[PDB]
Amino acid sequence: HMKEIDELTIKEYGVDSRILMERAGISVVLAMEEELGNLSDYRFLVLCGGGNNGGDGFVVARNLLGVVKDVLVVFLGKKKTPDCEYNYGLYKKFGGKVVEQFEPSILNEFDVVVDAIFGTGLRGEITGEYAEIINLVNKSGKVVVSVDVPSGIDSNTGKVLRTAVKADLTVTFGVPKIGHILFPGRDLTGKLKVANIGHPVHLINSINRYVITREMVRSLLPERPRDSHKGTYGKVLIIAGSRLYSGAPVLSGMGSLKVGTGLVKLAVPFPQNLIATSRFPELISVPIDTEKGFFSLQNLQECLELSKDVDVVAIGPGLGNNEHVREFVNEFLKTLEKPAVIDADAINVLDTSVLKERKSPAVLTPHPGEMARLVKKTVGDVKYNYELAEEFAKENDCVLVLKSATTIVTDGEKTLFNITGNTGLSKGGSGDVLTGMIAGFIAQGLSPLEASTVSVYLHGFAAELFEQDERGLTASELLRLIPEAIRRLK
Template sequence: MMMVEDIRGELDEVTAEEMAIIDENSEYLGVPRLLLMENAGRSVAEIIEQKVGVKNKKIVIVAGRGNKGGDGFTAARHIACRGGSPTVILIGRGGDIEGQEAKYNWEIIKRMDSSIKLIELGSYIDLAKLKAELDNADVIVDALIGTGLRGPLREPLLSIVKLINSCRAFKVAIDVPTGVNPSTGEIHGEAVKANVTVTMHKPKKGLRGNEQYTGEVIVANIGAPPEAEVIVGPGDVRFTIRRRHPESKKGDWGRVLIVGGGWQYSGAPALAALAALRGGCDLAVVVAPSSVSNAIRGFSPNLIVREVEGFKITLKHVDEIIRIAENLDCIVIGPGIGVDDEVFEAVRLIIEKLRSIGKPMVIDADGLKALVGHLDVVKGANAVLTPHAGEFRRLFDVDLKGSWIDKARIVINVARKHEVTLLVKAHPEDVISDGIRVKVNMTGNPAMTVGGTGDVLTGLTASILSKKIPCLRAAAAASFICGAAGSLAAEEKGYHILATDLLEKIPEVLKRFEPWVSGLSTVLEKRRV
């Protein structure tokens, strides 16, 4: 029987962002972050006990106000439970602690004043007071800043790190030594030089090659489910959404081109374009034959339609389409474009030209039919292919069978062979892979078998890709959002939803990941003279 371990792909190390996604997806799967923090702190205490002991030792935990500080608070409790008498020095004030889990554990250790000594340094950091505590320490635990580090250390952290390094104590870093970029390994001016680094769940990429700072690296199992690396969850969506700058202008947040439509189909390209807009891109342009361009315009005044002469897209239109595409961020090829040989020839040439300039693409529907027997055209392209199970079989001559784990193994192997990202609608799950990693989305419901939902998924994927998000990330997030929108629509309308109902629910899904938007409605009151 295949296990999740068999399909997790090449994830021996993780970036800070990948770890944050795993944390959030663990909670989505039912493992609270509070439990992850509990296990992290316990692991740190256990390793200190194994390495140097905790009884009759002066153990000083220097803690920041974030989650790494929360791990330190939890470690202090577990050290006390093992007979130690730790000191926790908070760099800042308890009221400024960030994150519910860290606050929760801070409140616990505040009540443990007979076994844990607490020192709040407040807004003014008294380095002399800190030095007096550290000079006589047997063990110093670095619980300052971990995967949240974004740039060079500033004062007072820089001086605190130098002070820690000047001490003779045995030093233990939680997750990543403060000052080491967890994703790149860059040293931000100064970094804690630890004897042991206890890193959570998986080694962080920035630890490799930094042995002078990390010392011995021990990976602690904190109880994050293996499925949290594979199942698409809210974490995968959150890290594709960026807060917009006040000075943002039209086009900064993505411009999508949809190449599609023909004398038989006008709805497919319109749905894809509207989904791209609902996904947050600034502009959605449809290139379509003149025979259908007015019908597409009629769907919504929000669409820009560029027409090319004739009843279908052919080779004579390719150069014009490429000129338009060069100024846009992501290209969708296929919705409703038609299935005759002339069209297929044009589709393949468009893909070849876009591949040569590295333009992100989403290839769907009739665009996939054009690739049957011509997969070399798309090999190595910066593209997402979105076949359903039948199209997958026709494209790759492979049946998708078995459990979701079996399907994931099949898809990752096919994606690796053809050097392309696949978003396979495998029913009831979607399987996404770039040949290195694989993700499986389980949102959605049987009501989404209605026509047009695939076009919505395609447009969403393109919208996220247009914001410079990598193919795997974009496809996984789009799959989750589309399925969640479908479930919200089904809650309201049962099995009687339309693809357009998904369009209306996409903002409802996305707004849950945009807490900053909720304050925008007060802008008039704030600026009233």
């Protein structure tokens, strides 16, 4: 929590709370200037609550006085905290104008709204004149700059507390908050700038949950020593596909190859295995003899044999979800002593007791529909629920990759948030590619958590490099863009 960090910085390091508040306010001014250019022609309406968010607001307003065309503060609170009171006092001593009554027409004489109503101190739903004013701002079409967090977003979860400000720019202090990272909060934040306001760097770095950055992924990418051969870069087996789903294995297999894996084999029911090599003859696609087009216990021994000569096994894409699949997946995972990447229909039939008894590592890659069925909760209770994800990973000794527009990656100790990607990934097949990518990076020597961190980043970044409209992106095009994502990352 930034709250712990503010407190320690004040009480133990000895930085006056007023100095942090001044630094906060001026970083808002500089952020606005970077975004709007010269501020001097603009008229500013600063909406201040009675808390420290409002106090930051008063610092902003005071620093604009005499330098812009107009500044007005609407003070919407009842009582003021001591720092808000101090900064209100300065704003007035410097000649600033404050009103306590809000007029619907007020928005008309201003170009920029600075939202300093509520920050991390929001508790409960917004109602009354707070709500009316936020709704009026959202209908106004003015430029909106939010202080710390858009008022109405819960900074720990990203949820909207009845209504919330939609900002063009949010300036936050020290570290991004969870509510800027998860949706709907991420959407209402608009462009996010993270300002250094003077916290010791040691405190800033000690936060246990963070955004996966380009620099983090660059330093995790495996080395490609020149004196190498395919064995240097590992082997993956993908157990995938069925009479119903002949394409999923292909997307997973190429996912492994495009991230640099040395050798990829699929095991796919015959004749569906032949589909893979008709499209990408660099893949090896082993025919598995099945009774009715689905993997079953009759195939257990062959798959365990194929697994002896690989570094990692991915299972699940396109398997189907029926009883013979369920028996195979669970007996296989119970006996397999290799890292496993478990996706799709392998999750849908997974007995989670099996994860507990496995000595080898696992990564699970559910979407929220699959996570919901796995833990027997509703989609809406698991979606963006990073605490549930953490508890699950810790209890089952795995890495959990919970896919969504912001993807959560956790082993129960460390939790990372991925924000690359766009809606071209909201289409069948995009998940099957990611499964291959993860197995691929594991085969090359990354830990399951590392492999997952790198893959979700690069997968999202590849989607963003599609040249035409994102809604037309398909999994095949995604594959082509992976090596461009890798180049641009370096």
